[PDB]
Tab-separated table of N, CA, C and O (backbone and C1' of nucleotides) in Angstrom:
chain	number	residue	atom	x	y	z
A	1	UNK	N	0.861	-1.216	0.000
A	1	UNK	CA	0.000	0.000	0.000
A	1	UNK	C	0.880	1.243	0.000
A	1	UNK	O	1.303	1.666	1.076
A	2	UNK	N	1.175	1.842	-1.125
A	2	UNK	CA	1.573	3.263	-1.220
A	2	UNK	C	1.116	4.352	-0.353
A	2	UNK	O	0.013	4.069	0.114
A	3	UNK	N	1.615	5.661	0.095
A	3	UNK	CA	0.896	6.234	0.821
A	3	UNK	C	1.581	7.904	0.702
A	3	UNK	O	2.771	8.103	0.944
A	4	UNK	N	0.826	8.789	0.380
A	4	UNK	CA	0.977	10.399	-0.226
A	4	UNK	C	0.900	11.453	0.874
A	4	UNK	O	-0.189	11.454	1.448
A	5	UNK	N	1.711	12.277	1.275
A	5	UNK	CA	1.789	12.827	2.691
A	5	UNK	C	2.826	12.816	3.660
A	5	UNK	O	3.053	11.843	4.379
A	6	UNK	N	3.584	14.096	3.697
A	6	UNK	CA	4.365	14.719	4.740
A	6	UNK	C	4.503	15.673	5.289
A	6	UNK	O	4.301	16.824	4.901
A	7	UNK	N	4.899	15.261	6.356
A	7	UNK	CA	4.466	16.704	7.149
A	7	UNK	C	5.775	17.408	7.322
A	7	UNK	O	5.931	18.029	8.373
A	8	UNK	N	6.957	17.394	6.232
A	8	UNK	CA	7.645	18.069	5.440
A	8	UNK	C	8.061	19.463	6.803
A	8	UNK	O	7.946	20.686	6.730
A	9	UNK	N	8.569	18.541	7.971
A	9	UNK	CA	9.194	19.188	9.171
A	9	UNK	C	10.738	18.954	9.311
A	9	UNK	O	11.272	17.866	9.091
A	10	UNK	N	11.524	20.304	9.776
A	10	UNK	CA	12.744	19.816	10.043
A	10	UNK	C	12.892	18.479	11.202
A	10	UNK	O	12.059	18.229	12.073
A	11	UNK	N	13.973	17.835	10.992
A	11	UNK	CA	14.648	16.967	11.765
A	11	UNK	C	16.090	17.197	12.341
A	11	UNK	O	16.422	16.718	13.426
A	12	UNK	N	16.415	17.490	12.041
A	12	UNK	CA	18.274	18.704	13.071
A	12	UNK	C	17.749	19.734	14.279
A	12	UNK	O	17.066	20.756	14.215
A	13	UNK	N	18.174	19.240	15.071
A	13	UNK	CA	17.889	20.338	16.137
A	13	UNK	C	18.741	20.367	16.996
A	13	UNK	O	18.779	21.371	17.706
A	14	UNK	N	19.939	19.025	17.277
A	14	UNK	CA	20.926	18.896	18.461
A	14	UNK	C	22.145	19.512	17.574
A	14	UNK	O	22.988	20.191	18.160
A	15	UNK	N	22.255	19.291	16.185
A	15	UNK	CA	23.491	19.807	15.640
A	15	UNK	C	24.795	19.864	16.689
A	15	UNK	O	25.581	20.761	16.991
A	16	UNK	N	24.659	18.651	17.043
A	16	UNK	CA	25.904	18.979	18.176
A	16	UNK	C	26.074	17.238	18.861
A	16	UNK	O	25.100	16.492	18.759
A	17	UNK	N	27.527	16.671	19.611
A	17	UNK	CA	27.464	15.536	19.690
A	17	UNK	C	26.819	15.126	20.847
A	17	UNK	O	26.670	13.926	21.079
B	1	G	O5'	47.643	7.691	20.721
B	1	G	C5'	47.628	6.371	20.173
B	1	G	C4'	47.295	5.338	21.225
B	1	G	C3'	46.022	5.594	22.020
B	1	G	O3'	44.868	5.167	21.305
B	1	G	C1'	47.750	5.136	23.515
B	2	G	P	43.437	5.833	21.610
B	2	G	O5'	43.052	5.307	23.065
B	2	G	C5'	42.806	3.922	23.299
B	2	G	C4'	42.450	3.688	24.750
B	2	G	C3'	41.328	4.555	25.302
B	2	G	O3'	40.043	4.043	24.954
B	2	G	C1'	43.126	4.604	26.804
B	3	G	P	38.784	5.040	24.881
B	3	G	O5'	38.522	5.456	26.397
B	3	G	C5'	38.087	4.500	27.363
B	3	G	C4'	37.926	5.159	28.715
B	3	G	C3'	37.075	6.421	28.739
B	3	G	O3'	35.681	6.124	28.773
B	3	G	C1'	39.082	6.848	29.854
B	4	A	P	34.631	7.202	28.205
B	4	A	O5'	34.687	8.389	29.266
B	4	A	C5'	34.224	8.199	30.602
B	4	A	C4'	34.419	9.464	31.409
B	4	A	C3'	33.863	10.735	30.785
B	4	A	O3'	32.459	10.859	31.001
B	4	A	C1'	36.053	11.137	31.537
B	5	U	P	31.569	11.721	29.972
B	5	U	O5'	31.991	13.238	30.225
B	5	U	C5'	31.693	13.885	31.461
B	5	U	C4'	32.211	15.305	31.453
B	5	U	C3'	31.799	16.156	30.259
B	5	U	O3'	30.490	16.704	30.391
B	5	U	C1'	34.114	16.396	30.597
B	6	C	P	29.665	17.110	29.070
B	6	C	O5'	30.491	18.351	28.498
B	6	C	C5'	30.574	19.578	29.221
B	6	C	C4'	31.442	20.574	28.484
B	6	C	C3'	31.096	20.846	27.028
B	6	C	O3'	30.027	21.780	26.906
B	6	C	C1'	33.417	20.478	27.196
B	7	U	P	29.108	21.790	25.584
B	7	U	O5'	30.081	22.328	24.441
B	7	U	C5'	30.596	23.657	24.487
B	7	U	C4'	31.505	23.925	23.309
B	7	U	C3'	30.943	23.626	21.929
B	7	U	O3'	30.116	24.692	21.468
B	7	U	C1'	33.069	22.638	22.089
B	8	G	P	28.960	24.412	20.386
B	8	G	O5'	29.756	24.096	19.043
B	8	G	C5'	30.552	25.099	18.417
B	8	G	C4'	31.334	24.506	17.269
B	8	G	C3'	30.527	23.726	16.244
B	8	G	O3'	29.901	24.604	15.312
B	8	G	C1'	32.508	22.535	16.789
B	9	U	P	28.563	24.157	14.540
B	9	U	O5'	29.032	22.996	13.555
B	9	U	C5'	29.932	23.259	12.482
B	9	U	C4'	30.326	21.966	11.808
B	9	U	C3'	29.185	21.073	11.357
B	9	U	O3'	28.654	21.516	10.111
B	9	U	C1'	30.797	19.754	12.492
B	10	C	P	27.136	21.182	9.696
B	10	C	O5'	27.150	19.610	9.437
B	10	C	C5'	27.943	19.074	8.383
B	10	C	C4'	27.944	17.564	8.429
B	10	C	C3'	26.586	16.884	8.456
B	10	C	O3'	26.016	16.801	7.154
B	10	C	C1'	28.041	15.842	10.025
B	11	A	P	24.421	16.691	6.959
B	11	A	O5'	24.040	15.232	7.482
B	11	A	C5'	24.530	14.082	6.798
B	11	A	C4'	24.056	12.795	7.438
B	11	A	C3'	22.558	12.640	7.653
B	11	A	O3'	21.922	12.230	6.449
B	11	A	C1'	23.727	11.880	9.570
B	12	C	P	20.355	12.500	6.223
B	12	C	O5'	19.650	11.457	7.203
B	12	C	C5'	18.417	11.753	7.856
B	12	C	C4'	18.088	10.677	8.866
B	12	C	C3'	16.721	10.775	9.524
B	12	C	O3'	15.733	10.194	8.674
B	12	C	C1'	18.358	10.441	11.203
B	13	C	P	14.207	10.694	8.736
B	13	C	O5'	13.665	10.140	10.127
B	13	C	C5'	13.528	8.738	10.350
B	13	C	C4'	13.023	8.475	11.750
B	13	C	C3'	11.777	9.241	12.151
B	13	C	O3'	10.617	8.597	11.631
B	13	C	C1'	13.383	9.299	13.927
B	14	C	P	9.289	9.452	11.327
B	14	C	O5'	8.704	9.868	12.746
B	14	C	C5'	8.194	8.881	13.637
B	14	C	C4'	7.682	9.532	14.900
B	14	C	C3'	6.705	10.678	14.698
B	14	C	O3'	5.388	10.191	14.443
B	14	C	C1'	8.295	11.234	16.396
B	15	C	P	4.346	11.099	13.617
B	15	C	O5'	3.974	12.285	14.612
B	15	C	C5'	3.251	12.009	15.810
B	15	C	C4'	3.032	13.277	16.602
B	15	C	C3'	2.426	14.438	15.831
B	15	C	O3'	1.009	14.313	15.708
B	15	C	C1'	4.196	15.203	17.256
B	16	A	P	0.277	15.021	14.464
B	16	A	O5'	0.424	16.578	14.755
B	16	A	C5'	-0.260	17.217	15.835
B	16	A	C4'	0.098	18.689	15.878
B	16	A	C3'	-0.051	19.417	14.559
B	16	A	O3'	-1.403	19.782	14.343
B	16	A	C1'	1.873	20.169	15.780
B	17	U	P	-2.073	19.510	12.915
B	17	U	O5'	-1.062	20.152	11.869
B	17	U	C5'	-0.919	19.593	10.565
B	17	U	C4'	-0.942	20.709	9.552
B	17	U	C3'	-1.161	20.310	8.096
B	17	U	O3'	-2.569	20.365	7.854
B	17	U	C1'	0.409	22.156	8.370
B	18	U	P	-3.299	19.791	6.539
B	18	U	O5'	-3.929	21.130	5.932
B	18	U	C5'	-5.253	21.631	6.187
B	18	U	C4'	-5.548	21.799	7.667
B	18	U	C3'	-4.512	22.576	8.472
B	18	U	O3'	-4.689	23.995	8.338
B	18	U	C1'	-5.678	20.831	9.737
B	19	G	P	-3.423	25.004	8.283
B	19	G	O5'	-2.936	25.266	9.787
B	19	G	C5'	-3.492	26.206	10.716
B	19	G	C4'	-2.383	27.126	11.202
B	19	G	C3'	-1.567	27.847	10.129
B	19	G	O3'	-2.219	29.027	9.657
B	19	G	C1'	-0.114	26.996	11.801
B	20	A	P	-1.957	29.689	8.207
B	20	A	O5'	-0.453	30.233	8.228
B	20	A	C5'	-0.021	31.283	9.098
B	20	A	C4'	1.439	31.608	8.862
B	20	A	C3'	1.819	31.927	7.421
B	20	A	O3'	1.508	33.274	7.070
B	20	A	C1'	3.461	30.531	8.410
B	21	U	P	1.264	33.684	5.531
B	21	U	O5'	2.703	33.612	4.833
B	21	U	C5'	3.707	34.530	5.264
B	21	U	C4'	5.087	34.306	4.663
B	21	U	C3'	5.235	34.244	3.146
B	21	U	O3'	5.259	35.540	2.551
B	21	U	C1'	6.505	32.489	4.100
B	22	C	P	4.858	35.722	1.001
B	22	C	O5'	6.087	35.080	0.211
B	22	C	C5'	7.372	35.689	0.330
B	22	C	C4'	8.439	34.964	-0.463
B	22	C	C3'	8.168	34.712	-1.933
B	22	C	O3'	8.455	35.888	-2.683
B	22	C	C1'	9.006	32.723	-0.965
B	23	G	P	7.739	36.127	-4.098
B	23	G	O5'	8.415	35.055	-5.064
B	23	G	C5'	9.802	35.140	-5.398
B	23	G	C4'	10.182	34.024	-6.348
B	23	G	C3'	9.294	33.896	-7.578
B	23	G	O3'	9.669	34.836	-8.581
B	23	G	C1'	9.528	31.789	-6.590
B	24	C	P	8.582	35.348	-9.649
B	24	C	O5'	8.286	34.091	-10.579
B	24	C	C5'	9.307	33.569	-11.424
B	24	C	C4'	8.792	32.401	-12.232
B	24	C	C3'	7.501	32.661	-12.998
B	24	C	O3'	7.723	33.362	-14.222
B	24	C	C1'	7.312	30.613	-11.859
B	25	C	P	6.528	34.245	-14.847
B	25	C	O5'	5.449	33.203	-15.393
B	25	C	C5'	5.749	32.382	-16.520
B	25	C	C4'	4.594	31.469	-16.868
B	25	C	C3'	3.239	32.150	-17.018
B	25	C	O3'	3.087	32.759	-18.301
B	25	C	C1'	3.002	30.222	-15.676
B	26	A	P	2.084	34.007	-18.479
B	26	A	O5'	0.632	33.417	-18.157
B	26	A	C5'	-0.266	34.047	-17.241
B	26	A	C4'	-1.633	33.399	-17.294
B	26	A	C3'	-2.598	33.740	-16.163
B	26	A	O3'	-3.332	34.928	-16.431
B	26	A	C1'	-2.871	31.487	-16.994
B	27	G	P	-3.970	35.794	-15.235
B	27	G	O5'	-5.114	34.873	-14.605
B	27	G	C5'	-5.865	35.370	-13.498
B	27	G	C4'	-7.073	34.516	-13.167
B	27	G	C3'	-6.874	33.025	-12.911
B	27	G	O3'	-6.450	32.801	-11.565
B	27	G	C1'	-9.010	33.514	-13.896
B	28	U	P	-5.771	31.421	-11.084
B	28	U	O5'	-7.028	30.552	-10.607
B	28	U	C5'	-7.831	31.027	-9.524
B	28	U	C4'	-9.087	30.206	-9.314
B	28	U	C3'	-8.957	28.701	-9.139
B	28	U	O3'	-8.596	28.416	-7.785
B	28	U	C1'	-10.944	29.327	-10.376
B	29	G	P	-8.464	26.925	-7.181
B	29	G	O5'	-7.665	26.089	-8.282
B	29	G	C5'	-8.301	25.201	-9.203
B	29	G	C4'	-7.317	24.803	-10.273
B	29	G	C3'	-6.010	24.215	-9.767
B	29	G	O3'	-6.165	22.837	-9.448
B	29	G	C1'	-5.535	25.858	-11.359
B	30	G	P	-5.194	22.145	-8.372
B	30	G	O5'	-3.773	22.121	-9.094
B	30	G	C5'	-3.557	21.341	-10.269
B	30	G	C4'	-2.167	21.578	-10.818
B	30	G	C3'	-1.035	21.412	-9.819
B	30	G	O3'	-0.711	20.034	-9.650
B	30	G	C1'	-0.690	23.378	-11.095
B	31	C	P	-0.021	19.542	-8.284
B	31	C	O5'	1.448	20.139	-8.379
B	31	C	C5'	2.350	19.663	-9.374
B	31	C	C4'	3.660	20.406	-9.280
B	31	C	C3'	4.296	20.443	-7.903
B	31	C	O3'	5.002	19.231	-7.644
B	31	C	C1'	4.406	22.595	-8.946
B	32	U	P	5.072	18.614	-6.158
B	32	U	O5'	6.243	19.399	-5.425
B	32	U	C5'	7.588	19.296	-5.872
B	32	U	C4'	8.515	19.337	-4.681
B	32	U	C3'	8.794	18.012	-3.943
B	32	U	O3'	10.060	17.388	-4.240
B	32	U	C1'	8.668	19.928	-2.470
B	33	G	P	10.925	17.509	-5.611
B	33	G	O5'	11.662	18.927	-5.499
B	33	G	C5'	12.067	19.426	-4.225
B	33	G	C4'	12.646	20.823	-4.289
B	33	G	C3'	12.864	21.471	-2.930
B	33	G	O3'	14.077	20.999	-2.353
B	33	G	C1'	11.890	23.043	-4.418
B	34	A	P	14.252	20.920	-0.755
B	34	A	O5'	14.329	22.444	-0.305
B	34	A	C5'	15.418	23.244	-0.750
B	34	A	C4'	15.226	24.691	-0.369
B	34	A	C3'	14.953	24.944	1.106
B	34	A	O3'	16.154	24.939	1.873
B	34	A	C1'	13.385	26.121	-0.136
B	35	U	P	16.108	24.587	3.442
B	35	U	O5'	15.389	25.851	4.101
B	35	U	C5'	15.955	27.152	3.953
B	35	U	C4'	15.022	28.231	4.461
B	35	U	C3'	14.494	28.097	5.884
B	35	U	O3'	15.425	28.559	6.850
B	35	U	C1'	12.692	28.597	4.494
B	36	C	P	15.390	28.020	8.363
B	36	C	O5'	14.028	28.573	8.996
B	36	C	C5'	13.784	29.970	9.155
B	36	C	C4'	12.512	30.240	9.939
B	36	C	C3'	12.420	29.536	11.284
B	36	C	O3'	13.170	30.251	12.262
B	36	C	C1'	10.313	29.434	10.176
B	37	U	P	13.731	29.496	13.568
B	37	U	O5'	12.449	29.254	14.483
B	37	U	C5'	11.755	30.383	15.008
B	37	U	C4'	10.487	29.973	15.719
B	37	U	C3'	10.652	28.916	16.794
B	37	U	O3'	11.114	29.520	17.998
B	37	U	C1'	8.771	28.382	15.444
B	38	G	P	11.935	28.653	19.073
B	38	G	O5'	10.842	27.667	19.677
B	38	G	C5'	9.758	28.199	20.433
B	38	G	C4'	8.779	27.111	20.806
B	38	G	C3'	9.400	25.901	21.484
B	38	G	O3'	9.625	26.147	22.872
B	38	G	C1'	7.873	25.195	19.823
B	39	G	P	10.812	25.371	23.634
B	39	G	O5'	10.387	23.838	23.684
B	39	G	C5'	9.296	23.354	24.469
B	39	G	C4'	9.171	21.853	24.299
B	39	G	C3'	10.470	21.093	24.521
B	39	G	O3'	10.663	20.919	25.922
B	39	G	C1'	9.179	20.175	22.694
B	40	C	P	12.048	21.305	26.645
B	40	C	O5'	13.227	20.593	25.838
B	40	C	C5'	14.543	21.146	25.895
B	40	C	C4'	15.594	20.071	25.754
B	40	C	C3'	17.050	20.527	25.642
B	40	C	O3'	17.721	20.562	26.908
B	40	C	C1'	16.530	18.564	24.304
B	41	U	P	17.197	21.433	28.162
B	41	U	O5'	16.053	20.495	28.755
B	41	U	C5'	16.379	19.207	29.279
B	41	U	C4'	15.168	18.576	29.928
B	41	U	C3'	13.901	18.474	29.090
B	41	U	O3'	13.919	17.345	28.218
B	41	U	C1'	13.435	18.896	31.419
B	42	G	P	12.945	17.273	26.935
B	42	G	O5'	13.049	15.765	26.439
B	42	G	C5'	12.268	14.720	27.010
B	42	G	C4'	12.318	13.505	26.114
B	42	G	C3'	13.707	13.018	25.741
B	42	G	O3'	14.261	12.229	26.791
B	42	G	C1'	12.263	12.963	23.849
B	43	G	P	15.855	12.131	26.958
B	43	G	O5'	16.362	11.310	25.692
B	43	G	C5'	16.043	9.931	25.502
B	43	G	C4'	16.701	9.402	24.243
B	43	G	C3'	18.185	9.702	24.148
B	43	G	O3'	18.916	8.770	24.943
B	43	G	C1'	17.097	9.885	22.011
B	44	C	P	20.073	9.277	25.944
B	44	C	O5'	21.399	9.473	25.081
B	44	C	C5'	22.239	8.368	24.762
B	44	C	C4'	23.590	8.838	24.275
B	44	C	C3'	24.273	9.917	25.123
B	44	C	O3'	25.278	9.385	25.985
B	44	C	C1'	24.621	10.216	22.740
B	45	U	P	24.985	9.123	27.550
B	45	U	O5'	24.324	7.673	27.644
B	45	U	C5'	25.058	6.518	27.243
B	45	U	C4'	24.400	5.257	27.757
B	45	U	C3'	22.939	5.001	27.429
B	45	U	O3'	22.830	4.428	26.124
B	45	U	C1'	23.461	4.337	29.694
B	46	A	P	21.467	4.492	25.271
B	46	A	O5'	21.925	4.247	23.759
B	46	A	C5'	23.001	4.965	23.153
B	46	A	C4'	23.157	4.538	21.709
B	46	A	C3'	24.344	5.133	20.961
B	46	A	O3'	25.536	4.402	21.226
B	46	A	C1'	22.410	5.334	19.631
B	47	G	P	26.991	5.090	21.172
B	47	G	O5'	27.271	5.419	19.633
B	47	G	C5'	27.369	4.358	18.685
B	47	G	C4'	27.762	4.843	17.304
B	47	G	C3'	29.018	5.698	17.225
B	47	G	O3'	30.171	4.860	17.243
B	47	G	C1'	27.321	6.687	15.904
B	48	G	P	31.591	5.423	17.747
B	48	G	O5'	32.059	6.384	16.567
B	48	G	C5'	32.346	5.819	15.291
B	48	G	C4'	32.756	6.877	14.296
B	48	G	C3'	33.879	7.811	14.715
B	48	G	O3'	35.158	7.202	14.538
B	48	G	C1'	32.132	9.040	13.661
B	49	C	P	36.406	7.688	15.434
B	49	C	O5'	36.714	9.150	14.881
B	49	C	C5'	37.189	9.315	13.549
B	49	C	C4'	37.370	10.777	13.220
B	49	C	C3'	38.203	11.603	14.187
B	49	C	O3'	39.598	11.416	13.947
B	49	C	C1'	36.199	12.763	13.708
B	50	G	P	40.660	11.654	15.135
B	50	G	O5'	40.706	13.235	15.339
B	50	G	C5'	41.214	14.054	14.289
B	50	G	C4'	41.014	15.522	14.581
B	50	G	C3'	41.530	16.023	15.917
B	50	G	O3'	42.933	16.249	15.847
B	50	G	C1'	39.376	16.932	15.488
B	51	G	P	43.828	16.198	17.181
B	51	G	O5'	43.442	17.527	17.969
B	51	G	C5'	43.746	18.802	17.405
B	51	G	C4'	43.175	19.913	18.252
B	51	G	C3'	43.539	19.861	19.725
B	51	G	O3'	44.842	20.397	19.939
B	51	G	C1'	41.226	20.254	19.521
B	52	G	P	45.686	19.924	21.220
B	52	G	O5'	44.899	20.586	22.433
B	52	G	C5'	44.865	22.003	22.580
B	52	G	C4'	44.032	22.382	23.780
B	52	G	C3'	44.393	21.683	25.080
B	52	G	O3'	45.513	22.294	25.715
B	52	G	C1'	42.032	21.740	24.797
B	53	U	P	46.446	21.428	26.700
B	53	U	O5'	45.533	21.145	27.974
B	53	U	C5'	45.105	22.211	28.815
B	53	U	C4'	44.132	21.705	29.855
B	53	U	C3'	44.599	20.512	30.669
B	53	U	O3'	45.466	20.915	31.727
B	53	U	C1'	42.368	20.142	29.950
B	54	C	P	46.532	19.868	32.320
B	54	C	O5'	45.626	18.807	33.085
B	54	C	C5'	44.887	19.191	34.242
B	54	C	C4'	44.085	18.022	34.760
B	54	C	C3'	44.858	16.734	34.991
B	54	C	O3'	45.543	16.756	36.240
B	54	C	C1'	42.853	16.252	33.825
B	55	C	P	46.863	15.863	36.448
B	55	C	O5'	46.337	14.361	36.433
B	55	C	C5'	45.479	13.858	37.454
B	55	C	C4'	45.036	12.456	37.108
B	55	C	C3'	46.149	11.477	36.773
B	55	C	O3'	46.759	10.955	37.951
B	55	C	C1'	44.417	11.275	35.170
B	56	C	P	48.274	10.423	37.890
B	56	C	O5'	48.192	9.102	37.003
B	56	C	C5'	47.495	7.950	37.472
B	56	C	C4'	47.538	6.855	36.432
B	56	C	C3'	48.912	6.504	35.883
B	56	C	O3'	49.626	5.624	36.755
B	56	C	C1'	47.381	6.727	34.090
RNA sequence: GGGAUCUGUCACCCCAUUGAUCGCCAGUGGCUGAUCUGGCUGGCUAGGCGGGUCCC
């Protein structure tokens, strides 16, 4: 089942180790 | 050479587009391409590399 839709949000936020 | 702490950089996941902004072509239309904020009191008792300091 294919599926159409994102909620096209950043994911980086710690940028750091 | 090892371990611990700190900093910088790089790679991802979840929730809120049903919230916000930009560009192009035509009147209703079409296009992820890019950008924003909040939760790090969600994950480094998930990963790699460099430098400084301490200890051996």
């Amino acid at each position: 089942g294919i599926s159409y839709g994102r909620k096209k949000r950043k994911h980086r936020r710690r940028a750091h180790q």
